[PDB]
Amino acid sequence: GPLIVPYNLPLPGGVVPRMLITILGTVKPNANRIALDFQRGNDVAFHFNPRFNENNRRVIVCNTKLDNNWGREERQSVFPFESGKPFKIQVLVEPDHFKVAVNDAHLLQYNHRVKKLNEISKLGISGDIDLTSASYTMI
Template sequence: MPVQFEAFCSGGLVPGWSLIVQGQSNSKDDEFEINFLSESGEIAFHFKPRFSNGTLIFNSFQGSRWGEEEVYNVFPLELKEPFEIEIFSDSEYFHVFIQENKVAQYEHRLKPLASITKVDGRL
C-alpha cells in the first residue's frame, strides 16, 4: 500500500537544507515521487524514479505547465529493496544521493528558495 507524506518548512528552503527519505519500494508500484512545492502550489522539484525503464525523472511545474524533463539513466534502486534518498539543496542545485552516492543534480528553476515551503510524496 502506498504511503503518502507531507512536511512543512517554516521560513522556506535555504541553502544547506536536506531531506532524507528511507523506504522500500512496493513490488506492485513501478514508481514513486517526491515533490518540493511553493506556497502557491508550484512544484519547484519533482523527483520520480521509474523502475520499468530504469530512469530517474526530474522536472518542475510552474505557470500551470510542466517544464522539460531531465532524465538520468543511473538507477541504483531495486524493487522490494530498502533505500535511502537524500535531497540536498545549495544556492544553485538540488543534489540527489541514493545509498550515499550522488546520482544527479537539478538546477533550481523556482526562486527565491524561500518560496519553497512544503515537501510531499508518495512511496
C-alpha cells in the same frame, strides 16, 4: 514507526542552502513510481520521479511545474532503486542546485528553476513505497 503515503513534510520558511532532507523507506514489490515534489504553493519547484517501467526501462525524470504546465524534463538513466529493497534518499539544498544522493552515492543535481527558495515550503512524498522516516537538518 510507519508513515502514511502520500506524506506532506512542511519545510517552515522554505529551503535554504545547507539544508539536508533525508528520506528512508522500502520500495514495494512490483513498484511503478516514486515521486518527491518540492512545492511552492501549486507550483512544483522540483519533481524527482523514479519510474520503474517507462517503455520497459527504468529512468529517473526530474522537472518543474509552473502554472499547471510541466517544463523540459531532465532524465537520468542511472537507477539505484530496486523493487522490494530499502533505500535512503538525501536531498541537499545548495546555492545553485538541489543535490540528490541515494544510498550514500551521488546521483544527480538539478539547477534551481524556481528562485524564491524561501517559498518552497512543502515536500510531498508519494508512490509505491513504505515510508519509514522523513526529516531535515542543517549541515
